[PDB]
């Protein structure tokens, strides 16, 4: 049940324009990354709420769902889209059921709750700029001096996770650049980690198995978490988990909660995305680019039975408890969009 | 001074793994502050000097003592009871922690009582406030522990089968309280009692079960490989269950579970609910509590019997240090069941139960 | 063993002290001692509210508790009760009223060496002053409250007059 | 009125085979509730227990329905309150009863609408024995036009394998019956294994036919995912410590005691009907070997979330 069944593509552009403008920005990867998708997904629905007129609540939850179903097929793999939607849907039917009852409680039809949703939407937006700032503080219960740590590729959440510990504890981290797609940011992170007083070492992606033998913990940042606790993460992370489990090395995941999604990884081949081979082999090698098959995926699936701990804005939680974070944050009716 | 000590407590993050574990213990009443209730003194002495001090009886004696503190409390005329009472109590904890670190059991009790003080109705009076939370405490001792124990033992003994060979380790009053039941309900079985150095806590378990007429077998932990071939079930009483499903009990508890699983015996964890913790531990070294190293100098089959050894000068010889951790964590892949008062749950289901009590709106 | 009050069964919206026997998948098979320990059922939902993820906290087994009656089917023996809807005060009015009856029955069970004695003495006397106890002490400060008393024999009857001395 | 209930139960099986034993049991009690006319809640739940245990002792104390019955009681038992008019009881009773049957019969379809996306174009599945749940997910996939192949276990001693392969073939689905002793050799070919469940356990276990754990470990050793389909009315409140801690109707796996008395393919060489009855009927797979559980409550995988949902039921 998408939106085009409700509103004509042209009148959508007049009623809620930013929606139609977002889909373009969403398919063209003008806005990628789960955070940038998340915050922009919210404040788009802000204007939507501030622009739709309606009478009964069942109009909204059927309307806002419909735009979401298209807002997903724009680029579905950027999961943070629906997660902001699915959370909004519960946000209204909670604000509904609380008001429909507190009015019944005032006893011996007022769709003017739009500004409450906006006060509820902006609440979740303000939570996003409060993702790392309340996650970085969990380090001092996990990072300790003289320990050896391994991560992979740029991940500011993990970056801020360590640097907070570096304030008082001195220790060492090991960085595996996320070749080919996380190369740039990963190098930068290590250069920043060095300033904070962290014996940081940059290694090729293939040097992972070698050094893990003397690694205490591995910290990882993901691109999203799926309904089975599995991980969709930027390329080359399974190399770390598989090398970790081979050494009984604990695996820790520092992720926000807006990436936690209930969609179930049915077929992986419809999850991973494939970027341009230009990041792997130069266009000049013309003989090769013709005679061969060149692929550059930039996601990676690691199964849930491989993560030992989840650092979230709500706290540390085993993977076998993620579901209770879902049902306390979403609604099973909104699994599919 | 405290910040000066806090500077010291920073420098204790050096090459040694156990650099951070706190060794500072006060075992005497020298230089005690005045605001320390007598019944607290007698407790702090029992904490630092007792050894068969189960994590349950501690929480009880702590609460029963706390009643006597509150009962004798006297708020200043210029301030109601709720305001400026934790401050008094907080000044009691800081003493008790200096005798021996707070157990997980004791801690959550502090966190609970500190809460009910806050939510306490201001429009009451002293004798109204006091008489109230003394029941809250007595209720906490009723529902959270004593009754919960009686549920566990009955729930645990149900899975005891005639012909079993039970293995406990290092005297868990709960685990003793279930075997004695299974004896009195008519279950036909026998017990293996695994003990270990330095304070052989297992003998007192052997003493109890023997005085109840239970076939018992006593071996040190070094005989686990030898003795597990007869065992069919393993019963463990924990000091706490982590939120990841791990079990936080005494030292050998990890090996007991490990050696058992590699011989296909189940690890049954009997632990109450108030001993659940919102925290998690990847290694048995980040969060722990030490015992004095001197206790394993007197190498003999005794500990008080002052017969020396070769390591008596370890404190004075460089490149030599003795230590004895008191707890370690056991991964949940080794724990088979947790026997909370909500029934037999899988250990991984702990944090939900923790979040279940947070229904306190 | 015997019955307490002349009504073989309690009426709806009475309040009865009752001892729990066992708890099953559906309710709590209780037995009311004010009517010769006859059985009755209390629905799970009508038990005191719970506070645990799973309550097998059956501390109350062999426990004397209070309850209100909902339905009665005398021809078949079933009784339905409820513990929740009992107020936090009339319970005491039952407890205050209970032990009086327990005290009275305690005297005849001694003399049980009873159903007749209720027929002869208890219930009609309670029918005269509302309840036995509420004037049972007056039998020492008065005798005209014995208007219409015909025991089976003055053999052990006067022993009562000598037994109201004790208590 | 009607005294024998098992007959009612026995009727619905012939009135419709597409419903399983637990489903009919609910339809019986609802009939038992409606055609009854009690006067006290005690009487109402009394005949319930009698009606339940009668059905329980009726079948060989089966688990799939003894589950369903116990849920049905502790369903209607909640939210039950007598308010003024007594008939509200029986009304709220049987009215909520058919409501449970509504969710009951509709569970087999709801799971299929969640299970078929597991089946992917060109994949290959493995199923042990016959399971109506495994049927729907496969067909609804095939009925939605997707190419896949399926192995089927011989399913001794129930032999239900010979039936399940037929049930698929009648829907244009390739089938290759594999001996019970040859699932290992089959694995490297399979992409995913899918089985039914005769009962689900507090620990997230899986009480099903005798061979499930046999191939649940192979899936582990072959790193191929293991999926199981189970309806909510099969969550049972028991807890085994090992893959053997289940109640035995008949004493199983006993040894003969002899005494000095001397007395390719060989399909006709099998155990007698007496030896088979000595072998066990059921088998339990611990939760570490199941990648996920397909229920009307959704796809469950935590194996601590099976308990929350299970605890949500029995109350």
UniProtKB/Swiss-Prot annotation, chain A:
GO terms for biological process: cytoplasmic translational initiation; regulation of translation; translational initiation. Belongs to the eIF-2B alpha/beta/delta subunits family. Its main location: cytoplasm. Keywords: Cytoplasm, Initiation factor, Phosphoprotein, Protein biosynthesis, Translation regulation. Acts as a component of the translation initiation factor 2B (eIF2B) complex, which catalyzes the exchange of GDP for GTP on the eukaryotic initiation factor 2 (eIF2) complex gamma subunit. Its guanine nucleotide exchange factor activity is repressed when bound to eIF2 complex phosphorylated on the alpha subunit, thereby limiting the amount of methionyl-initiator methionine tRNA available to the ribosome and consequently global translation is repressed. GO terms for cellular component: cytosol; eukaryotic translation initiation factor 2B complex. GO terms for molecular function: guanyl-nucleotide exchange factor activity; translation initiation factor activity. The keyword Mitochondrion does not apply. InterPro entries: eIF2B_beta_subunit (IPR051855), IF-2B-related (IPR000649), IF_2B-like_C (IPR042529), M1Pi_N (IPR027363), NagB/RpiA_transferase-like (IPR037171). It is found in: Cytoplasm, Cytosol. It comes from Schizosaccharomyces pombe (strain 972 / ATCC 24843). Gene3D superfamilies: translation initiation factor eif-2b, domain 1 (1.20.120.420), Translation initiation factor eif-2b, domain 2 (3.40.50.10470). The keyword Cytoplasm applies. This is Translation initiation factor eIF2B subunit beta.
Curated annotation (Swiss-Prot), chain B:
Its main location: cytoplasm. One of its GO terms (biological process) is cytoplasmic translational initiation. It is found in: Cytoplasm, Cytosol. GO terms for cellular component: cytosol; eukaryotic translation initiation factor 2B complex. One of its GO terms (molecular function) is translation initiation factor activity. Belongs to the eIF-2B alpha/beta/delta subunits family. Component of the translation initiation factor 2B (eIF2B) complex which is a heterodecamer of two sets of five different subunits: alpha, beta, gamma, delta and epsilon. Subunits alpha, beta and delta comprise a regulatory subcomplex and subunits epsilon and gamma comprise a catalytic subcomplex. Within the complex, the hexameric regulatory complex resides at the center, with the two heterodimeric catalytic subcomplexes bound on opposite sides. This is Translation initiation factor eIF2B subunit delta. It comes from Schizosaccharomyces pombe (strain 972 / ATCC 24843) (Fission yeast). The chain holds residues 106 to 466 of 467 of the full protein.
Swiss-Prot record, chain C:
The keyword Membrane does not apply. One of its GO terms (molecular function) is ribosome binding. The keyword RNA-binding applies. Phosphorylated; phosphorylation on Ser-48 by the GCN2 protein kinase occurs in response to low amino acid, carbon, or purine availability. Phosphorylation inhibits the guanine nucleotide exchange factor activity of the eIF2B complex. Keywords: Cytoplasm, Initiation factor, Phosphoprotein, Protein biosynthesis, RNA-binding. GO terms for cellular component: cytoplasm; cytoplasmic stress granule; cytosol; eukaryotic 48S preinitiation complex; eukaryotic translation initiation factor 2 complex; multi-eIF complex; ribosome. The modification Phosphoserine is found at residue 48. eIF-2 functions in the early steps of protein synthesis by forming a ternary complex with GTP and initiator tRNA. This complex binds to a 40S ribosomal subunit, followed by mRNA binding to form a 43S pre-initiation complex. Junction of the 60S ribosomal subunit to form the 80S initiation complex is preceded by hydrolysis of the GTP bound to eIF-2 and release of an eIF-2-GDP binary complex. In order for eIF-2 to recycle and catalyze another round of initiation, the GDP bound to eIF-2 must exchange with GTP by way of a reaction catalyzed by eIF2B. Present with 17100 molecules/cell in log phase SD medium. This is Eukaryotic translation initiation factor 2 subunit alpha. It comes from Saccharomyces cerevisiae (strain ATCC 204508 / S288c). The chain holds residues 5 to 176 of 304 of the full protein.
UniProtKB/Swiss-Prot annotation, chain D:
One of its GO terms (biological process) is cytoplasmic translational initiation. Its main location: cytoplasm. The keyword Ribonucleoprotein does not apply. GO terms for molecular function: guanyl-nucleotide exchange factor activity; translation initiation factor activity. GO terms for cellular component: cytosol; eukaryotic translation initiation factor 2B complex. Coiled coil: none annotated. Component of the translation initiation factor 2B (eIF2B) complex which is a heterodecamer of two sets of five different subunits: alpha, beta, gamma, delta and epsilon. Subunits alpha, beta and delta comprise a regulatory subcomplex and subunits epsilon and gamma comprise a catalytic subcomplex. Within the complex, the hexameric regulatory complex resides at the center, with the two heterodimeric catalytic subcomplexes bound on opposite sides. This is Translation initiation factor eIF2B subunit alpha.
């Amino acid at each position: 049940g998408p939106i085009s069944e409700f509103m004509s593509t042209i009148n959508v552009e007049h009623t809620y324009p930013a929606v139609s403008s977002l889909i373009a920005d969403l398919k063209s990867r003008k806005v990628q990354g789960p955070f940038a998708v998340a915050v922009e997904t919210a404040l788009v629905m802000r204007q939507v709420i501030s622009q739709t007129r309606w009478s009964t609540v069942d109009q909204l939850i059927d309307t806002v769902r419909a735009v979401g179903s298209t807002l997903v097929k724009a680029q579905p793999t950027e999961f943070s889209c629906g997660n902001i939607i699915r959370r909004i849907l519960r946000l209204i039917r909670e604000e509904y059921q609380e008001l429909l009852k507190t009015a019944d409680e005032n006893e011996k039809g007022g769709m003017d709750m739009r500004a409450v949703i906006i006060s509820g939407i902006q609440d979740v937006i303000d939570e996003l700029d409060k993702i790392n700032t309340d996650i970085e503080v969990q380090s001092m219960d996990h990072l300790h001096s003289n320990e050896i740590i391994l991560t992979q590729g740029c991940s500011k959440t993990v970056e801020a996770f360590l640097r907070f510990a570096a304030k008082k504890r001195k220790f060492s981290v090991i960085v595996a650049e996320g070749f080919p797609n996380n190369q740039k940011g990963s190098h930068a992170m290590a250069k920043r980690l060095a300033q904070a007083g962290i014996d940081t070492t940059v290694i090729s992606d293939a040097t992972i198995f070698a050094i893990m033998s003397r690694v205490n913990k591995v910290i990882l940042g993901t691109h999203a978490i799926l309904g089975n606790g599995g991980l969709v993460t930027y390329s080359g992370a399974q190399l770390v988990a598989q090398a970790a489990r081979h050494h009984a090395t604990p695996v820790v995941v520092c992720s926000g909660i807006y990436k936690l999604s209930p969609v179930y990884p049915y077929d992986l081949e419809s999850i991973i995305q494939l970027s341009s081979p230009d990041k792997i082999m130069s266009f000049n090698e013309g003989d090769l680019i013709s005679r061969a098959e060149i692929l550059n995926p930039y996601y990676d699936y690691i199964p849930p039975d491989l993560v030992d701990l989840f650092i979230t804005n709500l706290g540390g939680y085993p993977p076998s408890y993620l579901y209770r974070i879902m049902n306390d944050t979403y609604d099973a009716s909104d699994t599919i969009l | 001074d405290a910040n000066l000590q806090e500077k010291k407590i920073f420098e204790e993050k050096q090459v040694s793994i156990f650099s951070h574990l706190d060794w500072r213990r006060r075992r005497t009443t020298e230089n005690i502050p005045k605001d320390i209730h007598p019944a607290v003194i007698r407790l702090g002495l029992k904490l630092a000097n007792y050894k068969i001090f189960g994590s349950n009886q501690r929480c009880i004696d702590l609460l029963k003592t706390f009643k006597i503190v509150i009962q004798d409390y006297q708020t200043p005329y210029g301030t109601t009871l709720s305001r400026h009472l934790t401050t008094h109590i907080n000044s009691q904890i800081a003493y008790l922690v200096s005798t021996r670190p707070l157990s997980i059991s004791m801690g959550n009790a502090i966190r609970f009582l500190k809460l009910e003080i806050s939510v306490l109705d201001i429009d009451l009076t002293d004798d109204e406030g006091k008489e109230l939370l003394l029941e809250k405490i007595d209720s906490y001792i009723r529902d959270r522990i004593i009754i919960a124990g009686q549920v566990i033992v009955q729930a645990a003994t149900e899975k005891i089968q005639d012909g079993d060979v039970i293995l406990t380790y290092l005297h868990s009053s709960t685990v003793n309280d279930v075997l004695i039941h299974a004896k009195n309900v008519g279950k036909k079985f026998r017990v293996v009692v695994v003990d270990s150095r330095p304070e052989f806590e297992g003998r007192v378990c052997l003493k109890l079960l023997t005085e109840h007429g239970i076939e018992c077998t006593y071996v040190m932990i070094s005989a686990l490989s030898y003795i597990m071939q007869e065992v069919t079930k393993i019963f463990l009483g924990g000091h706490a269950m982590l939120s990841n499903g791990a079990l936080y009990s005494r030292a050998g508890t990890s090996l007991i579970s490990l050696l058992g699983h590699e011989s296909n015996v189940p690890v049954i964890a009997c632990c109450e609910s108030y001993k659940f913790t919102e925290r998690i531990q990847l290694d048995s070294l980040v969060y722990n509590e030490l015992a004095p190293g001197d206790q394993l100098v007197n190498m003999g089959v005794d500990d008080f019997e002052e017969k020396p050894g070769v390591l008596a000068n370890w404190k004075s010889v460089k490149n030599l240090k003795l230590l004895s951790l008191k707890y370690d964590v056991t991964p949940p892949r080794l724990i088979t069941v947790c026997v909370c008062e909500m029934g037999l749950l899988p250990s991984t289901s702990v944090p939900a139960i923790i979040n279940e009590f947070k229904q306190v709106y | 063993h015997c019955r307490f009050y002349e009504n073989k069964y309690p009426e709806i919206d009475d309040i009865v002290m009752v001892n729990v026997q066992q708890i099953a998948e559906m309710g709590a098979y209780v037995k009311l001692l004010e009517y010769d320990n006859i059985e009755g059922m209390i629905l799970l939902s009508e038990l005191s509210r719970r506070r645990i993820r799973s309550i097998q906290k059956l501390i109350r087994v062999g426990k004397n508790d209070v309850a209100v009656v909902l339905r009665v089917d005398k021809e078949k023996g079933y009784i339905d009760l409820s513990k929740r809807r009992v107020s936090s005060e009339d319970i005491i009015k039952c407890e205050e009223k209970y032990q009086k009856s327990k005290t009275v029955h305690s005297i005849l069970r001694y003399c049980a060496e009873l159903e007749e004695l209720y027929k002869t003495i208890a219930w009609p006397l309670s029918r005269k002053f509302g309840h036995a106890y509420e004037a049972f002490k007056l039998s020492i400060i008065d005798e005209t409250v014995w208007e219409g008393i015909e025991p089976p024999s003055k053999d052990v009857l006067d022993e009562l007059k000598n037994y109201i001395s004790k208590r | 009125g009607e005294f024998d209930i098992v007959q009612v139960y026995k009727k619905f099986l012939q009135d419709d085979p597409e419903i399983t034993m637990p489903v009919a049991a609910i339809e019986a009690l609802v009939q038992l509730l409606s055609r009854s006319q009690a006067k006290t809640i005690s009487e109402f739940m009394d005949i319930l227990q009698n009606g339940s245990n009668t059905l329980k002792e009726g079948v060989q104390n089966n688990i799939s329905l003894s589950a369903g019955c116990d849920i049905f009681q502790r369903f209607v038992t909640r939210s039950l309150h007598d308010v003024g008019d007594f008939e509200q009881c029986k009304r709220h009773l049987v009215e909520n009863g058919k409501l449970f049957i509504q969710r009951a019969r509709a569970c087999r379809q709801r799971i299929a609408h969640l299970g078929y996306p597991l089946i992917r174009d060109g994949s290959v599945i493995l199923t042990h024995g016959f399971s109506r749940g495994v049927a729907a997910v496969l067909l609804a996939a095939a009925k939605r036009h997707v190419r896949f192949k399926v192995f089927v276990t011989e399913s001794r001693p129930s032999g239900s394998g010979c039936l399940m392969t037929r049930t698929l073939k009648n829907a244009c689905i390739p089938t290759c019956m594999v001996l019970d002793s040859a699932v290992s050799f089959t694995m490297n070919r399979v992409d995913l294994v899918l089985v039914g469940a005769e009962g689900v356990v507090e620990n997230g276990g899986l009480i099903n036919q005798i061979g499930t754990f046999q191939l649940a470990v192979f899936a582990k050793h072959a790193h191929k995912p293991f999926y199981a389909v189970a309806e909510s009315h099969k969550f049972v409140r028991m807890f085994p410590l090992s893959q053997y801690d289940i109640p035995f109707s008949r004493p199983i796996l006993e040894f003969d005691d002899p005494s000095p008395e001397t007395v390719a393919i060989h399909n006709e060489l099998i155990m007698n009907e007496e030896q088979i009855r000595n072998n066990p009927t059921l088998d339990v797979t611990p939760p570490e070997f199941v990648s996920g559980l397909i229920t009307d409550l959704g796809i469950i995988d935590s194996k601590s979330g099976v308990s929350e949902e299970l605890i949500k039921l029995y109350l």
